[PDB]
Write an enzyme that holds these catalytic residues in place. Structure first.
Site, PDB file in Angstrom:
ATOM      1  CG  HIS A  61      28.170  38.013  15.865  1.00  0.00           C
ATOM      2  ND1 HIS A  61      27.542  37.117  17.826  1.00  0.00           N
ATOM      3  CD2 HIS A  61      29.026  36.732  15.740  1.00  0.00           C
ATOM      4  CE1 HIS A  61      28.138  36.344  18.153  1.00  0.00           C
ATOM      5  NE2 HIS A  61      28.406  35.911  16.711  1.00  0.00           N
ATOM      6  CG  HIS A  91      29.867  35.159  24.810  1.00  0.00           C
ATOM      7  ND1 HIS A  91      30.141  34.001  25.511  1.00  0.00           N
ATOM      8  CD2 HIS A  91      28.748  36.270  24.797  1.00  0.00           C
ATOM      9  CE1 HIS A  91      28.684  34.140  25.267  1.00  0.00           C
ATOM     10  NE2 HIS A  91      27.835  34.677  24.896  1.00  0.00           N
ATOM     11  CG  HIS A  93      25.255  39.478  24.234  1.00  0.00           C
ATOM     12  ND1 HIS A  93      24.154  38.527  23.298  1.00  0.00           N
ATOM     13  CD2 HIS A  93      25.808  38.091  25.165  1.00  0.00           C
ATOM     14  CE1 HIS A  93      24.739  37.426  23.507  1.00  0.00           C
ATOM     15  NE2 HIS A  93      24.748  36.888  24.389  1.00  0.00           N
ATOM     16  CD  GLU A 103      21.611  38.074  24.637  1.00  0.00           C
ATOM     17  OE1 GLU A 103      22.101  37.398  25.182  1.00  0.00           O
ATOM     18  OE2 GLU A 103      21.824  38.303  23.316  1.00  0.00           O
ATOM     19  CG  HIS A 116      25.710  35.261  28.603  1.00  0.00           C
ATOM     20  ND1 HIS A 116      25.350  35.303  26.771  1.00  0.00           N
ATOM     21  CD2 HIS A 116      24.806  35.800  29.025  1.00  0.00           C
ATOM     22  CE1 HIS A 116      23.834  35.749  27.350  1.00  0.00           C
ATOM     23  NE2 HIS A 116      23.639  36.074  28.248  1.00  0.00           N
ATOM     24  CB  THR A 196      21.315  34.381  23.824  1.00  0.00           C
ATOM     25  OG1 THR A 196      22.576  34.904  23.655  1.00  0.00           O
ATOM     26  CG2 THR A 196      20.992  34.277  25.007  1.00  0.00           C
TER      27      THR A 196
HETATM   28 ZN   LIG Z   1      25.471  34.931  25.290  1.00  0.00          ZN
END
Ligand SMILES: [Zn+2]
Length: 257
Positions: A61, A91, A93, A103, A116, A196
């Protein structure tokens, strides 16, 4: 398993991970007319050693760059914390469009992606594994990423993806200090919150940078080109991996500035 599509996505996650409807879930919307400013927040300090960088991993993902976390060569100190958190991965998102991949949201405004950077509490616990589920266990910096002009500091990461194309693929990613990805202002919000995505532990003390960083539209496309499938199956690009903002549930976001 759990994922981001209709059937396994965020709104269904409470079924298997019922903490999803908990009181300290993440992301939130930071309403700036409801933050409380704090005397007691020290400035955030990051001291990372580039030789702790270790491996970029495609996990289906998303992807993540792991760091070596055997010792306090790369630490996070300051802000709201009394002891040192130890870097272990960074990482991103992102979303299906430029218009919303972030996010966290600030006053309802959604950014294109979010970086993040994750640290665990190695003064209290002995492993990520022991720390990951602890209220004081995790420390994570969130940087909102605003589409605009290409961000040169993404190059190494962006160039490494071309070798982790498929779910499971991994590869050495070395000599990188990810404090080069943070904004130049170190102003931040902190609130008590969560992972998250699943396990969704309520173990994260969050550090939302006030200031955003840049990402270009094409650099976002590179993230979306990553594949959620294992080599030899049908290509399934990673269109998105961002969770909708959650209810604050009485929590207060503290401003540092
Ligand atoms: Zn994250």
């Amino acid at each position: 398993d759990w994922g981001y599509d209709d059937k396994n996505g965020p709104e269904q996650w409470s079924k298997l991970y019922p903490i999803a409807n908990g009181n300290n879930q993440s992301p939130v919307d930071i309403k700036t007319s409801e933050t409380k400013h704090d005397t007691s927040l020290k400035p955030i300090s990051v001291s990372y050693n580039p030789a702790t960088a270790k491996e970029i991993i495609n996990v289906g993902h998303s992807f993540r760059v792991n760091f070596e976390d055997n010792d306090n060569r790369s630490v996070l100190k300051g802000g709201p914390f009394s002891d040192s958190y130890r870097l272990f991965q960074f990482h991103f998102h992102w979303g299906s469009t430029n218009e919303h991949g972030s996010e966290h949201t600030v006053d309802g405004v959604k950014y294109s992606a979010e970086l993040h950077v994750a640290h665990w509490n190695s003064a209290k616990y002995s492993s990520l594994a022991e720390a990951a589920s602890k209220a004081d266990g995790l420390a994570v910096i969130g940087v909102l990423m605003k589409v605009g002009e290409a961000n040169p500091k993404l190059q190494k990461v962006l160039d490494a993806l071309q070798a982790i194309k498929t779910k499971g693929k991994r590869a050495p990613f070395t000599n990188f200090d990810p404090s080069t990805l943070l904004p130049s202002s170190l102003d931040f919000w902190t609130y008590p919150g969560s992972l998250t995505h699943p396990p969704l532990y309520e173990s994260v003390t969050w550090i939302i940078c006030k200031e955003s960083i840049s990402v270009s539209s094409e650099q976002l496309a590179q993230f979306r080109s990553l594949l959620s499938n294992v080599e030899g199956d049908n290509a399934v690009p990673m269109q998105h991996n961002n969770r909708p903002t959650q209810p604050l549930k009485g929590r207060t976001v503290r401003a540092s500035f």
